[PDB]
Structure 1
Amino acid sequence: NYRDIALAFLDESADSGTINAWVNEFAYQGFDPKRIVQLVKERGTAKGRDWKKDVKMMIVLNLVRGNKPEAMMKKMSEKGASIVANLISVYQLKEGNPGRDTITLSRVSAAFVPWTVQALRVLSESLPVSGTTMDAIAGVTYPRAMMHPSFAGIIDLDLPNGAGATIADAHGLFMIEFSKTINPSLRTKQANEVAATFEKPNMAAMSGRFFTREDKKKLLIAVGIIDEDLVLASAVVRSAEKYR
């Protein structure tokens, strides 16, 4: 009968190689970092622009005004809103979370994370969640580099002695306060309830294939998250503790 067909699957092949190949091909992917790095350089250069300057502007714009380019234009200076109007036109910018071939301010920050991680140190007080606010929650001075969701793309979870998990918990402390500020609906809700709202896309970002373990290592050292002896920074271990 058909029960025999289903039971016959006990002797059917289950190759860990081809299964993990399928897992990677089927896994959660909000957007392709390779595609938007490509679409930025191609669209920006075709419109004869310093696309490298535009990404720095789009990252500054994202960090301080959000991911709604059309909305932020109305409540901005005439000179500033003229730049934003040009950035929307050239890079075909959109709001929220659209398709894989669509560029958003949040995505530019995510794919070009080696610059966004630098920019965070100079405009920490102009952020939705200010640096001083974040310093009060953590106790010790919270790492400015971690003060944006795009930091997740730098986290290497497979780091020896479970260092990557401690970093993910440290960054989660910010993510909770960030979510409460972005959507005030979650301001009264419990800490673990808010943690589950960003758990899936952050995990997908940390498990990213764009930057290698070695690239992530160099980036994590560069912004002082880990010392030369691969040991974590004292503020990062405090933020992971306060996360619970």
Structure 2
Amino acid sequence: MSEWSRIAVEFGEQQLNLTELEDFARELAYEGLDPALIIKKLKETGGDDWVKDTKFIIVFALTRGNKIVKASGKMSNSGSKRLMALQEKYGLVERAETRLSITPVRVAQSLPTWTCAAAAALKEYLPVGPAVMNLKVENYPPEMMCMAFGSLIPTAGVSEATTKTLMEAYSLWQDAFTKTINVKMRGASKTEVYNSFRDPLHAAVNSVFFPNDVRVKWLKAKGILGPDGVPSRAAEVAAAAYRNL
């Protein structure tokens, strides 16, 4: 029949350019953030002040999240003043809407080794910390209690089983966190909340921005990986705890 049908049929008769297809898919794949863009942004706008500012912003992200106004009305006076000051200074937003967009949580994810260290030190101040986690498992790794830990899970220099175990241990926290903050998820299967965070996690782990060798070294320094390159008992127990539901 139509000319248009012949075109569709012929279109499906073309050879696939595999390399170019893979390139397109990678170009279009889920990306949580562009860390390099964010760091460039911070360093260029804040000057030498950018480190201090960034640390404070990260403390805010860790303890209160992205809701700048709503919290700011809800803290100490100096804290509020400074939070708003940083807000105007850096063009902070409460919601991640664009590739250029800078949220506090994105800042925290942009500097994961610092953020996770700070989170461990400020465990008692976390929205989902030891209070929630010790109930599920004994001695959950404090470095794991934040959105940035995904960036520190290595895909190289370790076995695939190690990577998997770490991802499950972290998945315990991701699940509990998602449930504790989302309206949507009060009663939901392990699998849907898992689906609510699968893309950011796989993207975070597979990202090439933060070097794997540094990840491995850092995990070893915190005792989350042994000197042998396999997960600590806390990691294994947490992983088992996530698998069991």
TM-score with structure 1 setting the length: 0.90
Are the aligned partners of 1:156 and 1:206 in contact in 2 as well (CA < 8 Å)? yes
Are the aligned partners of 1:32 and 1:100 in contact in 2 as well (CA < 8 Å)? yes
Are the aligned partners of 1:113 and 1:153 in contact in 2 as well (CA < 8 Å)? yes
3-state SS of 2:198 partner: helix
Are the aligned partners of 1:220 and 1:226 in contact in 2 as well (CA < 8 Å)? yes
Equivalent-residue separation in structure 2 for 1:151 and 1:77 (angstroms): 28
Answer with 201-210 or 162-171: which moved more. 201-210
3-state SS of 2:140 partner: coil
Equivalent-residue separation in structure 2 for 1:95 and 1:223 (angstroms): 32
Aligned residue in 1 for 2:65: 66
Aligned residue in 2 for 1:94: 93
Aligned residue in 1 for 2:17: 14
Are the aligned partners of 2:72 and 2:83 in contact in 1 as well (CA < 8 Å)? yes
Are the aligned partners of 2:96 and 2:102 in contact in 1 as well (CA < 8 Å)? no
Unaligned runs of 5+ in 2: 1-5
| 2:197 paired with 1:198 | yes
The CA RMSD over aligned residues, in Å, is 1.8
Code of the residue aligned with 2:60 in structure 1: it is: L
1:31 positional shift: 2.3
Alignment deviations for residues 56-100 of structure 1 (CA, whole Å, 9 cap, x no partner): 111111111111112211111221111101110111100122111
Answer with 81-90 or 179-188: which moved more. 179-188
Aligned residue in 2 for 1:128: 127
Segments ≥4 residues shifted beyond 6 Å: none
Taking a change above 3 Å as real, the CA distance of residues 89 and 237 of structure 1, as seen in their structure-2 partners, is same
Are the aligned partners of 1:186 and 1:194 in contact in 2 as well (CA < 8 Å)? yes
Candidates 145, 152, 165, aligned match of 1:154: 152
Alignment deviations for residues 222-241 of structure 1 (CA, whole Å, 9 cap, x no partner): 33221121121111011111
3-state SS of 1:84 partner: helix
Equivalent-residue separation in structure 1 for 2:89 and 2:179 (angstroms): 32
Equivalent-residue separation in structure 2 for 1:168 and 1:61 (angstroms): 25
1:218 positional shift: 2.0
Aligned residue in 2 for 1:25: 27
Taking a change above 3 Å as real, the CA distance of residues 241 and 90 of structure 1, as seen in their structure-2 partners, is same
TM-score with structure 2 setting the length: 0.89
Taking a change above 3 Å as real, the CA distance of residues 196 and 13 of structure 1, as seen in their structure-2 partners, is closer
Are the aligned partners of 2:151 and 2:205 in contact in 1 as well (CA < 8 Å)? yes
Answer with 115-124 or 181-190: which moved more. 181-190
1:180 positional shift: 1.4
Equivalent-residue separation in structure 2 for 1:8 and 1:194 (angstroms): 40
Map 1:102-113 onto structure 2 (within 5 A): 102-113=101-112
Answer with 143-152 or 160-169: which moved more. 160-169
Q: Kindly tell me the number of residue pairs found equivalent between the two proteins.
A: 237
3-state SS of 2:102 partner: coil
Aligned residue in 2 for 1:40: 42
Unaligned runs of 5+ in 1: none
1:219 positional shift: 2.6
Map 1:140-219 onto structure 2 (within 5 A): 140-157=138-155, 159-219=158-218
Are the aligned partners of 1:117 and 1:223 in contact in 2 as well (CA < 8 Å)? no
Code of the residue aligned with 2:148 in structure 1: it is: S
1:34 positional shift: 0.4
Aligned residue in 2 for 1:231: 230
